[PDB]
Amino acid sequence: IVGGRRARPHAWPFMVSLQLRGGHFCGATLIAPNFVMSAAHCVANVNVRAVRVVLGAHNLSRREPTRQVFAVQRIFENGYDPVNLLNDIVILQLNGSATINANVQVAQLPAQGRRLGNGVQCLAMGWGLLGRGIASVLQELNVTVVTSLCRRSNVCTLVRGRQAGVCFGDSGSPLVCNGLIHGIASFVRGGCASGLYPDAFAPVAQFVNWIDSIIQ
Ligand SMILES: *[C@@H]1O[C@H](CO[C@@H]2O[C@@H](C)[C@@H](O)[C@@H](O)[C@@H]2O)[C@@H](O[C@@H]2O[C@H](CO)[C@@H](O)[C@H](O)[C@H]2NC(C)=O)[C@H](O)[C@H]1NC(C)=O
Ligand SMILES: COC(=O)/N=c1/nc2n([nH]1)[C@H](c1ccc(C#N)cc1)C(C#N)=C(C)N2c1cccc(C(F)(F)F)c1
Ligand SMILES: *[C@@H]1O[C@H](CO[C@@H]2O[C@@H](C)[C@@H](O)[C@@H](O)[C@@H]2O)[C@@H](O)[C@H](O)[C@H]1NC(C)=O
Incomplete structure (x- = not known):
């Protein structure tokens, strides 16, 4: 920004950091306890088995006990078309469900x-x-x-x-x-x-x- x-x-509290090794590379939004949505370009060319889904974060540079971390179980796409810059949306299903609280909301x-x-x-x-x-x-x-x-x-x-x-x-x-x-x-x-x-x-x-x- x-x-x-x-x-x-x-x-x-619906704001999500997608991370590798760790380091933020993309945002996402919590849309159900076990699903986030993000841009399809964020994960094309990424090994999704390596991605960590960090909920409840604010300051990425600090240890934050408010955080909850998930892995990606599966991906749902919708005709992602990078050439025409169309349908830039993916849903990532998590390996478990978030605990919904003050810092993590759908x-x-x-x-x-x-x-x-x-x-x-x-x-x-x-x-x-x-x-x-x-x-x-x-x-x-x-x-x-x-x-x-x-x-x-x-x-x-x-x-x-x-x-x-x-x-x-x-x-x-x-x-x-x-x-x-x-x-x-x-x-x-x-x-x-x-x-x-x-x-x-x-x-x-x-x-x-x-x-x-x-x-x-
Ligand atoms: C700058 O943006 C803030 C916040 O935007 C609003 O809330 C977001 C979550 C989203 O829903 C946007 O579409 C909204 O516009 C604005 O803060 C509102 O400000 C009004 C004053 O008119 C106040 O009554 C509300 O309570 C504020 N809402 C919140 C949630 O804080 C602010 O007006 C914007 N400023 C300018 C100059 O555009
Ligand atoms: C016509 O202009 C144009 O093609 N601009 C681009 N901008 C792209 N791209 N292309 C690339 C891109 C490629 C395809 C699609 C789709 N659909 C969206 C983005 C890209 C990647 N990977 C990033 C990060 N970005 C990018 C750069 C800066 C910010 C953003 C953000 F998503 F935040 F908007 C995205
Ligand atoms: C869900 O995943 C959590 C974090 O997984 C971690 O990151 C992924 C990408 C891999 O590197 C993995 O080996 C790491 O553990 C786990 O901590 C958590 O136990 C999982 N929850 C489940 C299975 O319900």
Whole structure:
């Protein structure tokens, strides 16, 4: 997150760090005790048997007894199309179920097909690059939905009046709009925080019936 701020500790208890050897590489969202959802590009080319799913985290640099760590049992995809940057969504089934508490909560999803109008206010968040290197403390950022310089196959967002946006390592992190997870961070254009191209998220609302079929 470039140009954002520290989140309050455990403000977003559905927020997940995907890690290897350990080190954060992608965000994810807890959508049921035994499922997280993330971007398909986060795990294409990764050995998922090595991925650790870290719930309840805030400051990645510290020991945190609030954390719960799972492994990935299986992956559900939905036509991931990297060439056209489409269907950037995966559901990872965990090897066990999270204990739901103050620091670990299931996210709330929108209605199937629900669109967001130009001007909708959301928060992006994640432990991605700050502009520097990876964040230790979870970061958040106020962003605004734009439909211009964005396909109907994405939710796009832009910060106006300064350069700020998601960046590497924020991939797969939720975009929360009106208390609901409406995006998963997917791609940027013009480099991070260009101040020109909107950031692009997988449109979770298009995938809700598919998500519901998997998690129950
Ligand atoms: C910056 O964002 C904050 C928080 O965004 C809201 O809550 C998120 C979880 C998500 O649901 C977004 O779509 C929401 O916009 C905004 O904080 C709200 O601020 C209003 C003032 O109008 C206040 O009444 C609410 O209680 C705040 N909500 C929360 C949950 O903190 C804030 O307004 C945004 N600031 C700007 C300038 O856009
Ligand atoms: C047309 O412009 C364009 O292709 N931009 C890209 N940006 C990509 N990619 N491509 C790559 C990519 C490749 C395919 C898809 C899809 N669907 C999404 C992203 C990539 C990988 N791996 C990352 C991390 N990212 C990337 C960089 C910075 C932030 C993000 C985030 F997901 F956070 F938005 C993602
Ligand atoms: C679920 O997995 C937890 C963490 O697994 C660890 O990370 C994975 C990627 C492998 O490296 C694995 O060998 C590590 O243990 C376990 O701690 C936990 O016991 C598991 N829970 C179950 C099986 O219910």
